[PDB]
């Protein structure tokens, strides 16, 4: 019954085409509730969930201010990291940042995160103790030394333990009808002669699911879980069989693991 709140930031430099493109997206479990886009006209943080729209305008002012501050920080860090790696000004580079907190069923803090990336590879991450940093290369050791000399991990730990957890509790209470739901999969099996058997799992929330194929009780194509577009998720698994097979589905909403056989 644990819950999480995550924030994802992407900043891509566009040399010769203006300022870097900045995207900020907030998540509670698998549901997105806020979004900021630098290319949008409003230039404000915007709701993406119905339960977050009940917040006052001062909340959105504060969110817009903080997200624009983060955008400026990433904009400066793009040039700093271009200097670190001896990269030219012609190419485009990406900085990705993710942070958040984990909460339990009791509402108590479990885990805090902050991971940064440069060009799709790890750059620097906070350790599980929320006190030390892990650097991936020599350019990241400069950042690690700067952040240790600035005691940045202390402020980050304060945010992760205190502010993130309380606001996650508030969001979970505001969206208790949606965030605390668990939809069992709508499960069915299909047969197509080549032959193959496809085990469908549709309309389940959250996105964590396990589909396993067993031949007489022994484990053996599997597509990744994909969004249905309406707050639910879909997945299927396939097995090629000659002209005795069972598919097993495990989900939070399902009381017991299903055991599906053809026909």
């Amino acid at each position, epitope marked *: 019954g644990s819950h999480s709140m995550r924030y994802f930031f992407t900043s891509v430099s566009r040399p010769g085409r203006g300022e870097p493109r900045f995207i900020a997206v907030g998540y509670v479990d698998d549901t997105q509730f806020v979004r900021f886009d630098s290319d949008a006209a409003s*230039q*404000r943080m915007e709701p993406r969930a119905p339960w977050i729209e009940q917040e*006052g*305008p*001062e909340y*959105w*002012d504060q969110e*817009t*201010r903080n997200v*624009k501050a983060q955008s400026q920080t990433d904009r400066v860090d793009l040039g700093t990291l271009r200097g670190y790696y001896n990269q030219s000004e012609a190419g485009s580079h990406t900085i990705q940042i993710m942070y958040g907190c984990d909460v339990g069923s009791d509402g108590r803090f479990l885990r805090g995160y902050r991971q940064d990336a440069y060009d799709g590879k790890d750059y620097i991450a906070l350790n599980e103790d929320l006190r030390s940093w892990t650097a991936a290369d020599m350019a990241a050791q400069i950042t690690k030394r700067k952040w240790e000399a600035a005691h940045e991990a202390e402020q980050l730990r304060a945010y992760l333990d205190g502010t993130c957890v309380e606001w996650l509790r508030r969001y979970l209470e505001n969206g208790k009808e949606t965030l605390q739901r668990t939809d069992p999969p709508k499960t069915h099996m299909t047969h197509h002669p080549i032959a193959t058997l496809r085990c469908w799992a549709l309309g389940f929330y959250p996105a964590e699911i396990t589909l396993t194929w067993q031949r007489d009780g022994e484990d053996q194509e599997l597509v990744e879980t994909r969004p249905a577009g309406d707050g639910t998720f879909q997945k299927w698994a396939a097995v090629v069989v000659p002209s005795r097979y069972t598919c097993h589905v495990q989900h939070e909403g399902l009381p017991k693991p299903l055991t599906l056989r053809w026909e």
Partner: antibody
Amino acid sequence: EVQLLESGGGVVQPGRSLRLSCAASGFTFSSYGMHWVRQAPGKGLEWVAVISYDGSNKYYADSVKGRFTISRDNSKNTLYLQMNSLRAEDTAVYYCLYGGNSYGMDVWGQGTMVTVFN
Amino acid sequence: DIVMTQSPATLSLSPGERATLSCRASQSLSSSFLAWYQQKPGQAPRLLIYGASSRATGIPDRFSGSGSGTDFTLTISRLEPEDFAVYYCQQSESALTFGGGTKVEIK
């Protein structure tokens, strides 16, 4: 009626300290961040300090950095400005302001005069 | 630090004329964080426009705000005798910054 009331202003010797207060009424003072704005006679408005609704974030103008302290106590609905090492340049009318927002809520005080001279 | 440059410094106009006021920001701002104020020579400033285009409660229709990014404008289509005052543009994205103030006076 949404109202802001200033007190604690007056004449102060150069180099001494002084504290200003804002009493808030008619609105949920604890929900919003508050500003201090000063205006020297015959001059424009100059933002001094801001405190967030919970008091975690405090920012100051470069002219008053390290000398002015801003604080709130949400129980009595009061905003505080503590001014130390006051110079003659600090002579102005000081306003506590509930404003600077996108939804159009703007509440000013009546203004308290601080005069710094020998 | 965001610097708000307000131009011109003085508007010498006759009542019944059009007043155009300009504000320059040192960096691009979200339009929702720009406001205009009016101050009479003896009292606190009064908000006229918020969000760079939205009139406050009980503000006459002659006051109108426009602009985006770094350029913003305040227009008074018809100058009433009570409109002759000092006007300030203000940003609230990062702390608060007021413009120098444009004084509207009688020609």
